[PDB]
Amino acid sequence: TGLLDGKRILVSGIITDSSIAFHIARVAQEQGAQLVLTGFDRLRLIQRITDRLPAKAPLLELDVQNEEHLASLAGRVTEAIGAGNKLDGVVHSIGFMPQTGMGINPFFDAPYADVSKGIHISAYSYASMAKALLPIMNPGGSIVGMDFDPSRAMPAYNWMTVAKSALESVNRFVAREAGKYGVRSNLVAAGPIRTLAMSAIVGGEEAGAQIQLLEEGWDQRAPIGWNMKDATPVAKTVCALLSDWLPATTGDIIYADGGAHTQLL
Amino acid sequence: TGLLDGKRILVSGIITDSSIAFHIARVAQEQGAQLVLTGFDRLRLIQRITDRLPAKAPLLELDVQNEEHLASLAGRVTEAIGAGNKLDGVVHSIGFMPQTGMGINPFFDAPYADVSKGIHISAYSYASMAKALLPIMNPGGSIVGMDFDPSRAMPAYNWMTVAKSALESVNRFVAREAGKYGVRSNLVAAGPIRTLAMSAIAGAQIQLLEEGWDQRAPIGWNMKDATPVAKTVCALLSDWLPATTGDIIYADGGAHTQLL
Amino acid sequence: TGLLDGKRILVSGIITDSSIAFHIARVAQEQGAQLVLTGFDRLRLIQRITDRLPAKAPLLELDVQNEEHLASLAGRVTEAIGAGNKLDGVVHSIGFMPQTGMGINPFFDAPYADVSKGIHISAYSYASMAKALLPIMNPGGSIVGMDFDPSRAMPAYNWMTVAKSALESVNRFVAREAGKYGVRSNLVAAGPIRTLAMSAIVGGALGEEAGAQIQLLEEGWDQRAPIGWNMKDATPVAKTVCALLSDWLPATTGDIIYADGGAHTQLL
Amino acid sequence: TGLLDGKRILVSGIITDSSIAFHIARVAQEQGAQLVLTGFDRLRLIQRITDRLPAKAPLLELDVQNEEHLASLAGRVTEAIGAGNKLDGVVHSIGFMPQTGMGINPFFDAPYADVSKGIHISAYSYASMAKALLPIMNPGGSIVGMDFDPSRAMPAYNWMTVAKSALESVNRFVAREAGKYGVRSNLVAAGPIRTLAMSAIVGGALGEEAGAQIQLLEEGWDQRAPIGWNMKDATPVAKTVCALLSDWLPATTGDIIYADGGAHTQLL
């Protein structure tokens, strides 16, 4: 018996096989889940990547800025999972910020049009996906998004930090809506994992500073350490939330960061 | 000797004489500050309102969505305060959310275009104003914005809650920039005050506000009295919180410290 | 099959079958754990209660104020689980405050001797148990304590609120120590559950404010919780504790998981 | 003219002229306050130190573990300020932890007797002082205690961290009581300041790692603070305490003001 045996779970956000979503999906399939996957923009590349998962899973296109994609999403999921079936889980593992909003670009020089796009994709879309998909979720279901602790400012993360703060607030409102369906909504505040988006943050000249700051903020603080090349602990944590084993947690944030955020130094 | 004697302070956000900014401005003038005021959209109304302040102050137009207003702001402040003078303080007391983003409108039905406008005015603009004005601020200066505690979701406040969360995060980054100028940046998380914006968001509203605030506050909370809020903002503009930045001071009667 | 298949877990704090520890233990056995149980003071009563668990488990005496009990604990656990075996999990589900520290007794009238006893049992003992047991824990293990959100003051909970604040701080230090053994330490901040200790806060189920206690609990929890909250159902709490004892939260330590229906995320 | 013109303020915790309480008292007198001072144990030393304040102030003995001192405190303050006068302000700037509770001494080896003494003096006493003095405080008054941010664990601070967590919780309950008198209760979470407790007590408990201390403090504070942090300058902290004693934070209670250069708002 797998942790997610018989659950139907939608997973967004696979772009490469380092993607946090790829590992969430891998672990969920290892634990008996039937997945629907969504991908943005490079669908043929993404299909090649999702072929490396342990099991087959249909891949549906979703650009969270596209109103038509969102309006048709539930119908397209239903068609993939079979009429009369519903989702037990939804994973939002999606983010974006234009280059002006991150890295060494001065914080004040990001135009609002760029910041707005970032907040749309990174924060608002958590609400939009929940809106689209709650109508096809079973009671006892679980919506999970990915967070990066924005409680304190930090170098480089800049306007994405602002977007994460927004996302945390959105998650608490999504929980209010989701509760009417017997559905939980939570975020996983992950420690740093080496992904495509991670390399986009400085995106350059200061790659060395990024690694140094990450080692100082996370592995050095974490009482159990932190390995940025191992997404499994994060994937497992997301699977815990998708499971029946955190049935009283909603509107909330679970930290999968080796305990770093609990330690000052 | 007033608390803000000899300080030059820009105050945004006066629309009526209930405005939190109106009271911030009144108290700051009572404490010896020389003000510059900024107003949005209803300049003739705002001029009538600012005539009720204890002292005269120049009023400059500022729509925080207008790039040209922001690009000319510092020059227009400098011309009002006299060349070679700088600001000691900046008050951001500004917000907006379209009707779709608040009240009884379902949370999921606010389009992003509306939420975005709200975030632009209510959060991003804190950074915009700091960008425009830090180059004309003295060391030891203070930037203050108004917050409403968004740590927990609540009825009605909806997407404005999201905007306030964004604002809190923006404030922490503004503090990093402002520190290079020897300038502090902080928010005041105020309890509820009867203002124009409040009526934009009424018996259930007042009951919820009384439950969240006065009933929790160990010293009580009076929604018709802006003075405690204005004083708190003046404390932050003063020299008396010189080691506080990137931070949030709660002027809410202690409500947020009490569960029930 | 089970979430805790093959794990050896110590569970403290069973006094009745409403005890949060009793449900933690029940769920853990349903999920394939082998338990060792510890009990305080009323060992014969507790033995009768633990007979109602799904499976047999040895019961060992532990008064967390007793230095000798703590010094012999690991040896007595080892003898119960078999030499060469170690624990995978430890559950601290223990608390105490004298009556002067709770309820309608004025906050300022609790003498420090009483508050101190409360803090000793309710907070310091989390460190004591970890000290005693980490030497017999496997890497990958998990220590879990029970919390009640003390971030804001509230009526009645009074000095126990202070003890919980202390416990949260202790948990973060225990995490630092436990990390050296590859062991996690976390608390579960539970919503309210009707237990013996709950009734002791107002001086009994009959206590003068029992009515106000239930009203405040309904206002603080079920009314705020987006998924509701049932004070008569410990299962969601027990499951949450079992999640932490499992391998499924492997990157969480020094931390607090809220099993409160999401109440703490909502203002009203 | 002064921020605290005409206020009567009690200040505890002066032991040397580096004491945060000494600077709180200095600044308060510069701002027009009439003080009553309390000191512990070394009254002759403390009298010499308080002579270096800008104005004379009566000094009363107070050992916060001594029940008789607490029971007589109000009467002895009243006699110093004149019958029928009340205090506007009370400053708690008092702490203690035995060396076993700090530094390089292992966290698990601190006996509870030592921790308890620490918590008594550093946390419970905030309640005891408020109990003694609220009956002689005017409406609009202010009680202020000193905090060091214990939200996250850290090296060395150990069980004092636990005590500060307890103090924060105590402060929220003191606020509930104080509100009935129209009185505010708040803490100032200060950045690190070179004092006797810092250097001798915390420094001493670090033993052969005493040299680490400045490096750890610079990493936690000045490096994070957007306006920097100077450990040799207590004035920003003193001013912050005076802000809270003033009428200029009239809607803040049960709360914590951070006078740490903004360090706690920045991750790195």
Ligand SMILES: NC(=O)c1ccc[n+]([C@@H]2O[C@H](COP(=O)([O-])OP(=O)(O)OC[C@H]3O[C@@H](n4cnc5c(N)ncnc54)[C@H](O)[C@@H]3O)[C@@H](O)[C@H]2O)c1
């Ligand atoms: N990697 C880390 O260190 C880390 C830590 C904490 C949180 N997170 C968050 O985890 C999530 C996944 O990021 P990742 O690190 O795995 O990155 P990744 O680059 O592997 O994935 C980011 C995903 O966002 C998708 N996306 C962007 N714009 C989109 C749009 N308009 N519509 C739909 N999808 C869109 C991309 O298509 C991609 O699949 C993000 O929310 C990220 O902020 C990452």
Ligand SMILES: NC(=O)c1ccc[n+]([C@@H]2O[C@H](COP(=O)([O-])OP(=O)(O)OC[C@H]3O[C@@H](n4cnc5c(N)ncnc54)[C@H](O)[C@@H]3O)[C@@H](O)[C@H]2O)c1
């Ligand atoms: N009233 C309360 O209960 C309360 C409590 C906490 C925080 N706040 C915050 O205090 C601030 C002031 O609100 P208020 O209650 O005094 O209401 P108010 O209606 O009196 O003022 C809000 C101000 O926002 C200005 N504004 C809107 N769009 C703008 C734009 N494009 N450019 C510039 N200014 C713009 C309006 O002109 C008005 O002056 C806001 O940040 C609000 O969220 C209010």
Ligand SMILES: NC(=O)c1ccc[n+]([C@@H]2O[C@H](COP(=O)([O-])OP(=O)(O)OC[C@H]3O[C@@H](n4cnc5c(N)ncnc54)[C@H](O)[C@@H]3O)[C@@H](O)[C@H]2O)c1
């Ligand atoms: N019931 C709730 O609403 C609730 C909610 C959140 C947290 N908690 C916490 O849950 C834990 C268990 O509480 P409960 O509600 O199950 O209570 P309960 O009354 O069933 O059991 C409390 C236990 O504490 C044990 N204990 C007391 N003094 C002891 C000592 N000296 N040495 C060892 N054990 C000792 C008792 O034997 C008893 O088994 C406590 O930490 C409590 O604070 C309870």
Ligand SMILES: NC(=O)c1ccc[n+]([C@@H]2O[C@H](COP(=O)([O-])OP(=O)(O)OC[C@H]3O[C@@H](n4cnc5c(N)ncnc54)[C@H](O)[C@@H]3O)[C@@H](O)[C@H]2O)c1
């Ligand atoms: N120095 C720092 O870096 C720092 C930072 C934040 C908070 N604090 C806090 O500030 C306060 C003042 O400490 P400090 O650093 O000025 O040190 P300090 O040594 O100058 O003062 C500590 C005071 O505690 C008193 N005290 C101890 N036991 C007492 C008792 N039984 N009765 C009464 N008074 C007693 C001492 O007599 C002394 O005056 C404490 O609460 C401390 O935890 C210090």
Ligand SMILES: N#Cc1ccccc1Oc1ccc(Cn2cc(C3CCCC3)nn2)cc1O
């Ligand atoms: N998807 C996405 C995404 C979009 C914009 C920026 C980051 C995004 O994904 C992340 C990728 C990696 C991280 C972890 N992280 C933070 C940093 C910054 C530099 C050191 C501190 C902050 N580096 N890596 C966090 C993320 O949210």
Ligand SMILES: N#Cc1ccccc1Oc1ccc(Cn2cc(C3CCCC3)nn2)cc1O
């Ligand atoms: N300026 C502005 C503004 C724009 C959109 C929404 C609110 C705005 O100002 C406020 C006006 C009033 C309040 C306090 N408040 C919140 C509410 C909601 C009603 C139920 C509780 C929350 N009612 N009054 C907070 C505010 O930020």
Ligand SMILES: N#Cc1ccccc1Oc1ccc(Cn2cc(C3CCCC3)nn2)cc1O
């Ligand atoms: N074990 C134990 C224990 C010892 C002293 C006090 C409480 C104890 O266990 C709890 C029992 C019940 C609760 C939950 N709780 C809170 C309260 C109220 C706070 C609002 C009114 C009383 N009533 N029940 C929390 C607990 O820690």
Ligand SMILES: N#Cc1ccccc1Oc1ccc(Cn2cc(C3CCCC3)nn2)cc1O
């Ligand atoms: N009074 C008092 C007191 C008693 C025992 C221990 C400390 C006391 O006062 C302090 C003295 C100093 C600080 C700041 N501090 C912390 C440290 C630790 C060394 C590594 C960082 C934590 N060093 N200086 C905080 C305090 O409460």
